[PDB]
Design a protein around this ligand. Structure first.
Ligand code: EST
Ligand code: EST
Lengths: 228, 11, 222, 10
């Protein structure tokens, strides 16, 4: 709560996880199983970084382990997805899962029911591009998702208020008028409703794959999925 | 306890 | 629509509000889906009175309502239940406490989320004028990623901020409260998606008859 | 869909 806006931004920028590579193997064609394998193997490795990133989000480590578990269980796929959409901004029509795994919508058809989710992710990437979403805004949004998504399941709300001040500060510093500031704040936060929707559909899809024995999921993923 | 519960500690 | 003042926007949304309708596992689902079906007809009229909405093509109106209908039903339910801690006011003659959710498989989890949202509404002291703005935002936002709509959305944001300024909040307080309100829409989205999953499961299990309209709304979500 | 008609008749 002590942190200034500039300190908050620096903290969040510093905590950013790396972009990981997939285990993509260009020697063989994709199958439904092999693509699901790549994507879930990637998610799994990302998760370990996500856990350590969360610990660096102001206020998170003050919570009980149970509360930390609950927030990450609620938000993990939302966080993976907003990360994906951010990575994919400078690649119209494609999703940059990894630098060696850049897929267009046609490749999503490889997995039953996946292309619908690709389409939503692509539309969100387009919206980010239309808004000219900045990196400093992105990290604020990602932290908001972590702290908000499972919060209704005061300390947390104070941090959330601090991130709001931070978003407004960034916008003011960028020269937006006062009216433009609350309008953009709203536009950015309404994106979070769409990210929630995609996460819910993505979770249903993943559950479907598991229940059809399409891909072996790690114990961690099984449990993250089971929390839903 | 959940595996996440463990990872939140180790490290 | 883009011409209205903040006060005129509030007035229009207040005027447009739907009426409050009246109301075993099979009978409870029967009551709930019967209620929902009748509410849906009034929702369509309300939507037509949300400024900007009738400017849209028929195709786009249908799409927005198909996406948002359960979110809209739920935020209304949460609003009605605000002054009744621990209960959901589905209708004035169907006020259900938390444990009656157990009467239907998988329902109490959803009851719990709705109750938590109502609890959040209370702790924020959500106002009626704010509520109708939020319901309008849900209608226009939920399916919108699938420019004049974004201009109308900006106007409703303006209207929310106007209401907060009128209420005496500082600039800093306005921005913080705007954020708090909009973040609850993420929770309402979550609840609608869970509710849709539940309704689909009940349909498959033949536990209740559903109206042609409801079946249509449900199948819009695949 | 009935939705279409409701919108038109509204
Ligand atoms: C969860 C899925 C696999 C993991 C995918 C992933 C994997 C890694 C990542 O960084 C982002 C995403 C978003 C989409 C996710 C997919 C949506 C459906 C699929 O089952
Ligand atoms: C859709 C369900 C029946 C209709 C319910 C309803 C019915 C009427 C209403 O005004 C609000 C709601 C919210 C919750 C809905 C339920 C959630 C699960 C259930 O299937």
């Amino acid at each position: 709560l002590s942190l200034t806006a500039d300190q908050m931004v620096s903290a969040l920028l510093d905590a950013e996880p790396p972009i990981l590579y997939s285990e993509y193997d260009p020697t063989r064609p994709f199958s439904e199983a092999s693509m699901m394998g790549l994507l879930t193997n990637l998610a799994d490795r990302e998760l370990v970084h996500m856990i350590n990133w969360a610990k660096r989000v102001p206020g998170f480590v003050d919570l009980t382990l149970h509360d930390q578990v609950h927030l990450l269980e609620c938000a993990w796929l939302e966080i993976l997805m907003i990360g994906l959409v951010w990575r994919s901004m400078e690649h119209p029509g494609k999703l940059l899962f990894a630098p060696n795994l850049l897929l267009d919508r046609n490749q999503g058809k490889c997995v039953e029911g996946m292309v619908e989710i690709f389409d939503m992710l692509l539309a969100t990437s387009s919206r980010f591009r239309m808004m000219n979403l900045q990196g400093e805004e992105f990290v604020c949004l990602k932290s908001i998702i972590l702290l908000n998504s499972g919060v209704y399941t005061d300390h947390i709300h104070r941090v959330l208020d601090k991130i709001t001040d931070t978003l407004i500060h960034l916008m003011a510093k960028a020269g937006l008028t006062l009216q433009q500031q609350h309008q953009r704040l709203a536009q950015l936060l309404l994106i979070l409703s769409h990210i929630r929707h995609m996460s819910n559909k993505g979770m249903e899809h993943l559950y479907s794959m598991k229940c059809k024995n399409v891909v072996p999921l790690s114990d961690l993923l099984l449990e993250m999925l089971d929390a839903h | 306890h959940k595996i996440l519960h463990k990872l939140l500690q180790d490290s």
